[PDB]
Structure formats: structure tokens, C-alpha cells
Design a protein around this ligand. Structure first.
Ligand SMILES: CC(C)C[C@H](NC(=O)[C@@H](O)[C@H](N)Cc1ccccc1)C(=O)O
Ligand SMILES: CC(C)C[C@H](NC(=O)[C@@H](O)[C@H](N)Cc1ccccc1)C(=O)O
Ligand SMILES: CC(C)C[C@H](NC(=O)[C@@H](O)[C@H](N)Cc1ccccc1)C(=O)O
Ligand SMILES: [Mg+2]
Ligand SMILES: [Mg+2]
Ligand SMILES: [Mg+2]
Ligand SMILES: [Zn+2]
Ligand SMILES: [Zn+2]
Ligand SMILES: [Zn+2]
Lengths: 518, 518, 510
């Protein structure tokens, strides 16, 4: 725990973090649809679709244990409504005990397997029914087919979208009550019950990352972010070490140190370790890019579209890695040891900053000619990757908001994965499938390597000719892993939900599924 | 108090000239019905010809000299016309056989001169004074002017004639000599006589603001500007207090303090007070934006057209308020108490600067999400407005070089006024009329308020979607006045005289007439 | 048809060379086992060292004592194998004849990539361009695939050939020494064919927009079909109107050249087991239209290359027509036009109707290729084929995603994408599969028309364009190959002729 330096006494000295959220107070009950649905207080929503028939009629198929509600939901009455994806309706009636009940449905369209994107749309509709309605309970009845992973994703997403982050509200808090109870009716319920607590853990790891990402750069700087990581390790009983500048100089981490030279906050390198109590069969290092604010440095983000105002989000890789630490430390997988690493710093303009053209020496002794101070993420990752390989692990996976070009290549929905090992890339792609966080495999094109040849240094930080900047970044990172299966996930395009004006906490579940299924 | 320096050659005060050559001019007013004595120096007739576009000159005054009367006969004048701003010089021997210079300035053919027309007249008169070593000027009014326009004539003559040589060293004008006497002949002289020393006061308030504005950012910084304000207050016997960082921290002025974080000069908040002896019937806070240099901060003024080289002028608001303090302190109105306020600081790039995205807390507890460090003026004004309202005043008027959009809406001639109270706005418009500093009322459009809703903080500093930036800045300021009549004068477009390459000292006479009228 | 002219000096046809010096090279391949004969011309060894940039050491026996001396280890040690490094020396052989002997460095890595083999070849071509030689012999002291061997041959031939049509010497023999020489012999004439289809494509692309316009390009395609005995049909503006190709006709509106739609057909002898339509973007000059290419980086000077897909599809027609694969039927389609600024041009905001009835709101007149392809895809689908593959210089964003080396392929059918990926492997023209992300589809929801041509929000423009194209195929396996990044060799200042060998491999394989 280090002291956060301040310029004025009003500067904050820690990131506010909510651990005990209202989602954690929700009691979840799962029931099998074969027993019929009981319809009482709160709101009961049926998820309904109509395979084949685009915008086909709503038909409720579950038995409802109430004659009045059954009459209301009969085919004749329901057929005037359709299943258009995201569409919803509210119903009011008196049940058999003469107590008014609210019921409704959300349309799930006409395609029998919902994509992760479609399910998100269903959930967003559901959340709009929760908002601006003081409810003690929500009950959801599944009349659509979902596998266990998709069921879990539904719950994670519901929890995540429902939770409102009011840490920075003062005079403008939403005068917002949360349900206390969530009932779920589904066929073969016993088989889905295990997903409930798993969803609740994955929600929090995601939401925890999101809290770190949304925290502004005055709150979340390298000192306060490494202090938060210390606190998280203490809560989960993970080992931890925070390396400070004296130890970083001793390790010759010149690339990482150069990036931080301009900051009033000392670099802090985060190292958390989870080890299973049994025989360790796999060792994994997860590396996250940890830039708490990216101004660009002397290559200032001044160009139209450079989005300097969003650059508190440049520690999203680090957040995903810490969200993963939360999930792993909670679920406690066996036979594995996991290292959670981030070379945390801030990229600023100062008499002290590194310069375009500076030649700096990484910890593996490679000299690097700086071509653009705004390509700082790959310099911090270079040193974090050398540290990670020294740990003697089987896999290194880094995750980073590394290149704006991702917005032009995969866009805002899919992350890109690059790597030096196909078995490991396939594992990441499998984790993507079971986490429902989409990733697409992109190539490291060796032909571009030659454009990183420096006239003076051992290597160039950037290409002068190749515009394929995400692949060029990957080529540069590859030079810092000598003999270990490595994969790199570029989340520059996917991390921030531009429409909703908030983080996604992208990568937490992906990396956790990777760890668990190994 | 002590001005920090980087090197010993950095200046530690603003040079300020109080006893200017204008102050040494002996001014006499005579009634025109006694006829004009033409004895020495230069004698200029102000002549028009109503109806006749570019009509002939006809000198109507009685002239007490046969030789000069002969010269000025209609036949001899008929070659010349009254085209606005046109002028001629004549040379002749008078009755005492002493050579004299005589001439005229054409005042056009519209019998009521606008402020801009009158400025054109004065500029032509001034070109006759330049490059001619004269000890005396006499001006004969053969046009119609009310008392306010006569005063405007003199104020404008004084200000345009005065040349600012404080930063000249090897290039002072070896030929500049100023007249020692000004004679004025006008109909109903006795009623105009009162205007002479009022003009001299108003000239000085305006010229003082001008000196402060023109003083570059290495001379005029938060420390030297607040020191100059103390010296002013001492000279006029005003109560004064300068609030330093520790007091500002105690007052929780987090928005103002965040702006000045990246500067080598500590924040200084100026608070001067004039109080009439006797019953105080109106209490007024005048608030001036006082950014001594606006680099833009991490949103650096680097786009083409951003005028970074002009940004020493971003304390023009504060200068108008201090110019006003000079006039009020000199003229001593009854029945009022006036607070002259400025939150002074410099907006710089540093490891210590606030960043885009930072969430800061204003002195009224509202949290603000910073969307652009270059919208700094509204942050400093926010805390200054909160401070003003705590004083328990009847009216709060702020004046500020706030938005570049003023150049596209009103341009360089008229300031914009916005406000929450129609009677206050009308007072300002009234003062605009009698000061001859033009102002136009612009709307605060509440439909745009929703664009300042922040996802995380209570409010956004800037709009995501609305390009009407002067209106959006007024919506933001309005959030920091709770229940007091308030108006905001945006002088961004009018403050600097781009053609003459000098300040106008805009707003000193406006604000003084506002105080005096009330 | 006759090409319109503004002045009598305007060209009325594209000059094409069919018979090239490459066609006069006699090629012979020999087994390395019996040693090499260095009797005449230039001999180059392809040598690696599996020591990084370590020394050259030559292992083949040579049947000349003087040359054998030159090639002794002690001498060869002074040179290194760094990929693409070369040296060659003139000397007198055993019968006092002048010969030149050298090596090209093949690096330290066993499997040579496509890109590495290109480097080897550029270095070889550097020597050929600089020397008056009647014969070249190449000795493979490195291991190559049959396919990579053919690739070596195609690249050699293509790079060596110089295009002099607009300006106002070659070897006559090629000897190749290689292990298991008998297995590589059938690669030789296949390469010569792939060379020419690629070179032809390159000639159309390199041809400036005053020479190559929708009229002269369609005339060239007719002449190709005639030389090859393919069926051909050029659709003119009247038939295009009859067919309601309003998206395509709109793009052509501002141009002095009438739109011409090319449709060539290859049919196999024997039972036709597969039908395929290959559709190429054929914009003969893309100015951007009222959305003019004026922005820094917009490369308006290169936009003669905007018919590269069309050229790939015609080069493929040459290969298919020549090689004559069986059990397959192939349609070669291109909706050719030119995108210009005029009083007659289509405008930003215009609503146009495609041949399948879909109305389209134009957001950008520079997204013209997808409009021409929309009509071409409808046309293609009406043919009842098994696969439709289009190839197009569609989005500048490709430079930012895959870059200049690898094309992107998007599709609606994994089986078909997999076949294209495999054709990529065997052609050695690299392609990477990119996703059609359906979450972006809603951004093409137009307020007024059935669909928007462009997204306002999504910057992933190559995916957006694919989502748009996808709306014009209803029920047929389809893939789209975006070659905007890949088509032009910026550094060498010439086309690559990219896609010809890919599509021919696709046709020959499946
Ligand atoms: C100089 C370039 C090769 C690299 C440069 N990279 C960066 O700026 C990273 O440090 C940025 N964090 C990338 C970024 C930009 C916009 C939105 C999301 C992510 C980029 O522009 O992407
Ligand atoms: C970021 C924007 C919404 C607000 C911004 N405002 C400012 O820069 C003020 O701090 C400027 N001092 C106002 C200004 C700009 C140009 C000329 C004269 C005056 C402006 O660009 O007008
Ligand atoms: C408006 C956009 C969505 C589409 C636009 N597309 C085009 O300009 C195509 O018609 C161009 N022919 C593609 C192109 C541009 C630059 C370099 C190589 C290739 C583009 O610039 O990508
Ligand atoms: Mg950067
Ligand atoms: Mg500013
Ligand atoms: Mg175009
Ligand atoms: Zn970054
Ligand atoms: Zn400012
Ligand atoms: Zn095009």
C-alpha cells in the first residue's frame, strides 16, 4: 500500500469500489416448468419465440397454476401480440386469490438459437421493465431453448445491465430500488441450478473490471490501481507483490519505465498469484495492459477522432485480468497456478517524458527505437511479457486496448486474438464460445516483420510503412516471448460500450473460462 | 505574494502606467455661440451634411478671426466633402499674424452617428494627431451629440491616442509627443462639462484593463495579476482579500483548483469590495474570467484557427472587472456595495494537469465530468459563481472570453448576454446603450440541458451533441446559481481588436454604467 | 462497340500483349543426383543454412573443374545466406567459355513462405534484368512443395516480364536442377499458364482509365472469349434497363462511357457436376463521385486499379479456358462502369432500386462498388449456380485490418469459405477468413428506403459492406474477397494481378 501523491488536497487518494452490490442481495430460486408457474407478487415475464414465423404470434405454452391468469394468457388473447425480438408487453389482472398480479412477455424472435447479441437485446428489454417500476420480485419463464452456457450468460448479463454505478454521483443520485428476489422457470431445472452462483461470480468480476475502467484517471492512477489490486488479493487470499521503481530499475525494465517517466505517479507493476492447493498441472500468466491515462505523450492525441477523452479506459486489459483474479480466487480451480500481471503507468506530457526517437532498452536487453510515444502499450507489454516468461509458465495470454485499427477491422463486437501457437489460440476461441464473449482469430503476418528493422536500434517500436497496425503491434510483442505458447487479445474496439456510455468489463469471463476449462 | 521564476530574467510584476500622458492634457470646454478663437495648434471642425450623401463642407460656427473666417467661406470649402471619416488640413495666418492649422473631419450624412461611426470619426482625428508635433488640439462640434456620445467621443479619443510602449526598449517612437491642451467648442457647453472628467475616468479604467490584457503571460500570471489587483485596491482604498490555495482547498473549490493544477503559478482568487457610505440598497457581484494563459491543457489548442498565440487575452473578463473597480472606486457611487471577483489561474500542460475524463467536485458539491480541458473557463466560473452567491447579493454578473463560437454568431462588434432574469438582462442592455459598448441578448435554450447529463458524474462540462457552444456554456453556468438574478456576458469575439492588434478593454464602461445606473 | 472520344487523340482500345518473351523460354528440369552442367549462361544456387545468416556452402556436384573451384567451401564461406542476399561472378569454364555463377540466400528456415520465395525471386530477377544472358539455370539446394515450385516459376515469369506498352533481351532457356525432378515437370506448363492469366490481369489493371474504360474493357473481354472459344454476351444500357439494374446503372450515370456488363461462360465437356459464378468489381476509374476522393490518403491517382476484381476474373477465364478442367461450368461476370462527377451523376441521398426490387439509400457516392455488385449478385443468382464468389477492391479499411499482404474473405457458407482457404494454400495467394457480424446489420436500417448503402456509425467498413452484399444472395453459397489492400504493389509501382491463381485453383480443385 503506497501513498497516492496529490497536487491539491482535493485530489482523491483511492478508487471507490463497491463490493457488496444490490445484485448480491437478490435471492435466486430456479423451478422446473413441469410443476407449473405460480404467479404472485412482482412481475412475471415469459420469454417467448415463434420459430419459422418472423413476427409470429405469442402463444404461452407453460402450465400456470392459476385459473384467472391461465384464462388471461390463453391463445385467443395472446395471438394479438407478436414475438418480434426485443418487443415487450405488460399485463395486469387479479389471480385466484383476488390479488392483483403483473405479467408480461419479451419477444425472442423466430430463430431458435439466440446469439449472444440477440440475448443481450432480450435482456435489455427485460431491464427496461425493471427500471422505473418499484418491484420486490421478478420471475422469468423460459419458453425458449438455451444451453447451460447461454442460461448463465442470460443471468450475468441481466445482473450486469441492471446494476447502476453511482459512485461518482453526489447531487444527482437516482431517487431506484432493486428486486430482492428472482425466480426462474425452466425445463430440466436441476441441470441449470449450478449456473446460478457461477453467473453471480462472473457478473461481479465483470462489474469489478467495469468499476475500475469507469473510474476517471484522477481516481484510478498507477498507485491507486495497484493499491486496489492489493486489497483484492487480501480479500481473496491471493499472493501479491507490487514492484516499485527501484525494483523495476534493478530488473532493467527500460521500456516500461520510459513510458511512465512523464507521470507524477510512480510506476507500479502488479503481480498476483493464485495457486491450487493440490498438484499443479498447468501454469498460466495473464498479462493486462495497464495505462491509467493515455494522452499519447509528445505524440499527443490531438487528431480528430483520437478520443483523448475516453483514455481512462486504457487500463481495461489490467481490469479484465483483475476481474479474472476475482473469479478465480472465488471459484478456486484445482491443479493450476495463475499469475495476474500488469505493468501499470500513466502516459503524459512533461519536461520528464520520453521522446519520439528515444532509444530505450527492454529487460531482455533488446534496444527499441521509439517512433511514436502513443505506441506506449506495446512497450509496457514488452517488459511485462519478459517478466511473465521468466516465471516458467505453460501459457502467456495478454489482453490490451492496443490499437484503434481494431475499430476498422472487427469493430465494436468482436475482439481479435493473435498468437504464436495454434493449440493455445484454439483454447482461447473455445473459451470465447463458452463465455459468450466473441473473439476472432487474426494472423501475425511475418512479411511485415522487416518494416520493424531499425537503422540504429535492435528494433522499431512502430512500422513506417505498414498501416495494419494491430498485426504490426502483434509482431513487435512476439519478439518478447522466446520459447512459450503466447496469445494476445486486442480489445481496443470492444472494451467501451459507446452507445451505452459505459465499459463492458470485456475479457473477464473469457479469461476465467480459459483458466477453468484448462 | 512572491512571483515564482524559472530563470532570473523572468519578470516578477506587470508593468503598469498610472499617470499617462492623457492625464496631463488640460481640457477646456467653451460654448460655441461665443465664437471660436483660433490661436495656435490644430483646430478641427466636426461637420456633416444631413441628407446629402458625400455633400459639401459648410462651416457654420462663428470664428473670431477675420483671416480664418475668410479661409473657411463656403466658396473655398466647396471642393471638400463630408464623407464619414474623411479629413483635410488647412494652413494660414490669423489676425495676430501667427500661422495656425485648421481642418475638418467629415461625419457623413446621417444626423445620428452610431458608436461605430463615431469611432471612425475619432480614428480620423487621431491620424491628424499622429506624426505631427502639436501642443494643442481644438475640436468644434458642428454635429449633434447627446451627453453619452460626447463622453464616448472623449473616452475614445483618449484611448485611441494613447500608445502602449511598456514593452518597447530599442524601438520606442522617438517622435511621439502628446498635446498638452484640448479645447472643445459645443452648443450648450455647461451641460457637457460634467462629462469631461467622467470620460477621463472611463478612459483610464479601459486603458488599465487594456494594459493587463496586452501584458503577455510571462508578465501577467495569477500571482502578478492578483498582486496588481491588491495595489489597485490600496490606491483606491477598496477592501481586498486574495484567497490562496489553502483557503481555496478549505472552500472546496475543486473545479477552479483542477484547472490550475498543471501551472507553476499558484491559484489566486481576487476579491475586492466597494461599499458606499450610507444606506446600501443594491449589492452586486461582478465576476471576470481570469485565465492568464489558456493553452487548452491536454486538449491542446493545436487545430488550425485555434489562436493559441492570442490566449494571454483569456483574462479579459478579470481585466474588465478590475477596470470597473478603478472607475467605481474613483467615482464613488452612493447606495451600493460591489464585489469584484476573479478566480485567477493558468491552464497548462504538465505531469500535474487535470485530464480529459477526470471527475471533479465543485464547491457546491456537484460532481463534474471533464469532457475537454479546453472548456476550463466555465469550471473556474462555476466555483466563482458559488462563492458570489454565498455573498448574498442582488445581482451576479459574469464577463468572460468563454467560447470561440461567439465569432460565428455575433462576430467582433457585439458581445452576447445570457441570463436567468429578464429585468437584469434589460439593465445590462440599458447599460450597453449608455456606455456605447454593444451587447445582444442570446437565449439559454433549455432543450439542450439533457446533453449535459453525465453517465457517472452529476453533470458534464461539455455537450456530446450540441454545437451551440455559447448556449451550452451558459446552461452549465446556470447550474451554479441557485436563486439569484444572474447574467453572463460572453466577450470572446469582441475583446481583442484584431485589425488594430490590441485589446479593446471591452466591458469596463458597460459594467460601470450598470453599477452607476443602479 | 465503338469507344466514345472527346478528342481524336483519345485511345479507342486497350493495348494487350498476348505473345510475350516468357512464352519463348524453353524450360527443362533435371534431377540434382547426377550433378549439374555449367556449360553456358548464368547458374544460380538457392542455398540456405538451417546458423542464422551463416555462410554459403554448396553441396551439388558440378561437371566443370573451374566452376567446382569457385564453389569450394573456402570461397563460398565469404558469403552468407541472409534471405535475398546474392552474389554472382563471371568466369571462364573448362572450355574457356564465359559463364556466370552465383547464389541467392534462402535464409535459415526450412519451410519458405510465399513471402520468402517472392524475396528469393526478386533477387534472381535483379540479376536477369542486369545481364545479357541466353540461359538461366537454377539449382534447388533447398526443399520445396510441388505448389511452391510452381509458385517459384510463376513469380519468376511475372516479375521478369516488363510491361512496355505505354513507353515510346530475355533468356531463351531455363534449366532447373531439383531432387525428384520427375514429380515437378507437370508444374512447368501450368505455371506458364498461371503466369499469363496473372500478367493479363496486370495489363488490364495497369492500363490507365483513358485506355481502359467500360467500352474498351468489355471489347477486350469479347476478344479474350473469342481467342479461347468461350461463350460471351455483353449487356448494354437498354438490356440493363430492361433488367432493372438501377443500382448499377446509377453509378454509371455521370460517365461518358455507357455501362457494359460482361458475361463469359466456360462449359466442360462431360457431365457438369458444379456450376460457379465468379463476379469481379469493374469500376474503370473511381473518382468517388460527388463524394470526391479529396481527403489526404484517398489515393485518387491509383483509382484506375478499381477494376482489379474484373481483371482477376478475366485472367481466371484465360487459365480455365486454356487448362480446360472437366465437370464444371463457370460464368465470369463483371458489372463494368466508371464513377464520375458530372451534371448527370448520382447524388448523396439518392434512392435507387436494385434489380431484385430493394430500394437503397445512397449515403456515400464513393461506396459505388457494392451497388454495382448488388446488381451483379442478383444476376448471378438467377443463373442457378452452386457457388457465387465475388472479388473486389471494395474497402480502404482492408489496409488497416489485413494490410497489403493478405486478402479478406467473408461469406455465408463455411464449406465454401473453407474451399477458398484451401485454394489460397495451393495458389500461394494468401487469404484470411473475416467475420460477417450480424449485430452490425441494424446500422443499415434506412429511415426511408429498404436499406442503406452505408452505415453511419460502424467503422468496421469491410464487414458492413459484406453485410450489404449479403442481402443480394438469398439461397446460394456465396463468398466475397476484398482485395483493396492486396491488389496494387505500392512499393514496386505495379499490379500484383491478385486473385487469378486463387480463383483458378478454386475452379480446378472443387
Ligand atoms: C501509433 C499507432 C501505431 C498506435 C496507436 N495506439 C494507441 O494510441 C494506443 O496506445 C491506444 N490506447 C489505442 C486506442 C485508440 C483509440 C481507441 C481505442 C484504443 C493507435 O493509433 O492505435
Ligand atoms: C471545448 C469547447 C466546447 C469550448 C472552447 N472554449 C474555449 O476554448 C475557451 O476556454 C476559450 N478561451 C475561448 C476562445 C476561443 C477562441 C477565441 C477566443 C476565445 C471553444 O472552443 O470555444
Ligand atoms: C465510403 C466507404 C464506406 C467506402 C469507400 N470505398 C471506396 O472508396 C471504394 O469504392 C474504393 N475503390 C476502395 C479503395 C479505397 C482506397 C484504397 C484502395 C481501395 C472507402 O473509402 O473504403
Ligand atoms: Mg497511446
Ligand atoms: Mg479553453
Ligand atoms: Mg469508391
Ligand atoms: Zn494506449
Ligand atoms: Zn479559455
Ligand atoms: Zn471503388
Amino acid at each position: 500500500a503506497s501513498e497516492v501523491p496529490q497536487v491539491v488536497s482535493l485530489d482523491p487518494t483511492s478508487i471507490p469500489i463497491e463490493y457488496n452490490t444490490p445484485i448480491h442481495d437478490i435471492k435466486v430460486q430456479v423451478y422446473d416448468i413441469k410443476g407449473g408457474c405460480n404467479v404472485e407478487e412482482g412481475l412475471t415475464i415469459f420469454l417467448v419465440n415463434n420459430p419459422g414465423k418472423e413476427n409470429g404470434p405469442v402463444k404461452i405454452s407453460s402450465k400456470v397454476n392459476d385459473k384467472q391468469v391461465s384464462e388471461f394468457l390463453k391463445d385467443e388473447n395472446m395471438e394479438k401480440f407478436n414475438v418480434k425480438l426485443g418487443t415487450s408487453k405488460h399485463f395486469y389482472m387479479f389471480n385466484d386469490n383476488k390479488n392483483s398480479v403483473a405479467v408480461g412477455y419479451v419477444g425472442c424472435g423466430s430463430v431458435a438459437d439466440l446469439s449472444e447479441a440477440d440475448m443481450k437485446r432480450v435482456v435489455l428489454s427485460l431491464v427496461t421493465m425493471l427500471h422505473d417500476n418499484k418491484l420486490s420480485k421478478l420471475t422469468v419463464v423460459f419458453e425458449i431453448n438455451v444451453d447451460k452456457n447461454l442460461f448463465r450468460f442470460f443471468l450475468e448479463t441481466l445482473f450486469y445491465e441492471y446494476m447502476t454505478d453511482e459512485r461518482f454521483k453526489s447531487t444527482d443520485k437516482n431517487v431506484m430500488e432493486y428486486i430482492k428476489h428472482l425466480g426462474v422457470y425452466i425445463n430440466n431445472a436441476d441441470t441449470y441450478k449450478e449456473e446460478v452462483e457461477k453467473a453471480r461470480v462472473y457478473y461481479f468480476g465483470t462489474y469489478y473490471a467495469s468499476q475500475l475502467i469507469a473510474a476517471p484517471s484522477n481516481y484510478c492512477n498507477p498507485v491507486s490501481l495497484s493499491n486496489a489490486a492489493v486489497e483484492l488479493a487480501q480479500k481473496l487470499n491471493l499472493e501479491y507483490k507490487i514492484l516499485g521503481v527501484k525494483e523495476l530499475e534493478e530488473l532493467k525494465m527500460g521500456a516500461y519505465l520510459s513510458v511512465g517517466k512523464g507521470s507524477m505517479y510512480p510506476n507500479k507493476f502488479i503481480h498476483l498469484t493464485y495457486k491450487s492447493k493440490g498438484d499443479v498441472k498447468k501454469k498460466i500468466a495473464l498479462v493486462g495492459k495497464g495505462i491509467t491515462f493515455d494522452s499519447g505523450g509528445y505524440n499527443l492525441k490531438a487528431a480528430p477522432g483520437s478520443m483523448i477523452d475516453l483514455m481512462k479506459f486504457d487500463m481495461s486489459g489490467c481490469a479484465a485480468v483483475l476481474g479474472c483474479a476475482y473469479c478465480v480466487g472465488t471459484l478456486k480451480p484445482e491443479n493450476v497456478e495463475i499469475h495476474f500481471l500488469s505493468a501499470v503507468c500513466e502516459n503524459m506530457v512533461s519536461k520528464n517524458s520520453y521522446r519520439p526517437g528515444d532509444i530505450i532498452t527492454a529487460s531482455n536487453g533488446k534496444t527499441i527505437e521509439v517512433g511514436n510515444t502513443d505506441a506506449e502499450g506495446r512497450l509496457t507489454l514488452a517488459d511485462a511479457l519478459v517478466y511473465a516468461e521468466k516465471l516458467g509458465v505453460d501459457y502467456i495470454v495478454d489482453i490490451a486496448t492496443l490499437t484503434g485499427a481494431m475499430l476498422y477491422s472487427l469493430g465494436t463486437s468482436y475482439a481479435g486474438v493473435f498468437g504464436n501457437n495454434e493449440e493455445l489460440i484454439n483454447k482461447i476461441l473455445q473459451s470465447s464460445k463458452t463465455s459468450n464473449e466473441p473473439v476472432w482469430w487474426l494472423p501475425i503476418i511475418n512479411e511485415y516483420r522487416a518494416t520493424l528493422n531499425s537503422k540504429y536500434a535492435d528494433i522499431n517500436q512502430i512500422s513506417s510503412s505498414v498501416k495494419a497496425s494491430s498485426i504490426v503491434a502483434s509482431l513487435f510483442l512476439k519478439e518478447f516471448v522466446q520459447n512459450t505458447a503466447w496469445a494476445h487479445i486486442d480489445i481496443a474496439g470492444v472494451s467501451w460500450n459507446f452507445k451505452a456510455r459505459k465499459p463492458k468489463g470485456f475479457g473477464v469471463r473469457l479469461l476465467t473460462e480459459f483458466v477453468l476449462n484448462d
